[PDB]
C-alpha cells in the first residue's frame, strides 16, 4: 500500500551485489509472517499515554503492508506481557516465517518497560534482557537464523537528554 | 545427530531514546519516534536494509528540536543485511 514497493529489477540488483550476506526471504505464497504489538495506554498510577491509539494504528498498517500478521495487545502487566511472549514464541506460524517484529509502547525506566499496574513503591516492569531471552534459539527455535526486530517506544528514565554548549 | 547453535543471534532492538532519557509523545500525533520510524520505513524499505533505515531515523533526530530525543539501536546480532523487499 503506502510503502514504496521494490521493483523486480532493483530487487535482483540488490540480490546480485551481495547475495551471500542477505537473510533469505520466504516465498510470498507460502510464508505466514507474525508480528506482535503490545501497547499500554491505560495505567493505574501513572498519567495515561494519550496518543497511543495513533501509534497502534500506525505500526499495524505498516507491518501489514510489509507482509506481517499483526497481533495487538493492550494494557498488560509485566506478567501478562511475559505470558503473551511465551505464547508468541510458541506460535506455529513462525515455522513458515522468515523474520518477526516485536513492538512495545508504554512508559518506562532505565531498567525496563512499564506494565499497567506499576507504581513508584511497587514495581511492574519487564526487564529488556527478558524479551531477548524468551525469543532466542533455546526458548524459540522456530526463529533461529531468522530476523527478530524489537522496536520500543518508552521512556528510559526522567532526564531530558540534553546539555548546553556556548556559542 | 546433534549440532551446536548460538543461543542468541539475529536480534536487533531500536529504542526511542538513549538510557536515562525520556521520549516524546503528542495526544493527536503520537510518538515522534514511531511516526518517524514509519515515515522512513515507507520510504526506504525498498532500497535500504533495516540497520541503515534505523540509522536514517537517528539522523533525523540529530538537530535538537526543543523536544530533543536520540534513538538507540541495541543488542545487534544481525549477521547479515535485512532488506524487507516490500512488494513480494
Amino acid at each position: 500500500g503506502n510503502v514504496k514497493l521494490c521493483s523486480l529489477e532493483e530487487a535482483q540488483r540488490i540480490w546480485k551485489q551481495k547475495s551471500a550476506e542477505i537473510y533469505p526471504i520466504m516465498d510470498k505464497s507460502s510464508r505466514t509472517r507474525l508480528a506482535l504489538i503490545i501497547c499500554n495506554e491505560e495505567f493505574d498510577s501513572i498519567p495515561r499515554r494519550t496518543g497511543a491509539e495513533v501509534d497502534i494504528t500506525g505500526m499495524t498498517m505498516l507491518l501489514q503492508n510489509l507482509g506481517y500478521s499483526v497481533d495487538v495487545k493492550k494494557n498488560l502487566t509485566a506478567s501478562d506481557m511475559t505470558t503473551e511472549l511465551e505464547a508468541f514464541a510458541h506460535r506455529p506460524e513462525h515455522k513458515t516465517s522468515d523474520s518477526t517484529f516485536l513492538v512495545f509502547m508504554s512508559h518506562g525506566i532505565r531498567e525496563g518497560i512499564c506494565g499497567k499496574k506499576h507504581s513508584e513503591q511497587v514495581p511492574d516492569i519487564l526487564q529488556l534482557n527478558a524479551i531477548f531471552n524468551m525469543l532466542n534459539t533455546k526458548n524459540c527455535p522456530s526463529l533461529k537464523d531468522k530476523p527478530k526486530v524489537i522496536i520500543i517506544q518508552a521512556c528510559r528514565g526522567d532526564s531530558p537528554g540534553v546539555v548546553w554548549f556556548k556559542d | 545427530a546433534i549440532k551446536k547453535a548460538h543461543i542468541e543471534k539475529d536480534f536487533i532492538a531500536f529504542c526511542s531514546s538513549t538510557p536515562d532519557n525520556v521520549s516524546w509523545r503528542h495526544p493527536t500525533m503520537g510518538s515522534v519516534f514511531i511516526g518517524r520510524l514509519i515515515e522512513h520505513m515507507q520510504e526506504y524499505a525498498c532500497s535500504c536494509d533495516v540497520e541503515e533505515i534505523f540509522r536514517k531515523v537517528r539522523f533525523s533526530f540529530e538537530q535538537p528540536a526543543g523536544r530533543a530525543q536520540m534513538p538507540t539501536t541495541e543488542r545487534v546480532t544481525l549477521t547479515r543485511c535485512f532488506y524487507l523487499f516490500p512488494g513480494h
Binding site: 498519567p47 499515554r49 496518543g51 518506562g108 521512556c155 | 516524546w24 503528542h26
Partner: peptide, 4 residues
C-alpha cells in the same frame, strides 16, 4: 507534549 508529554514524557513517555
Amino acid at each position: 507534549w508529554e514524557h513517555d
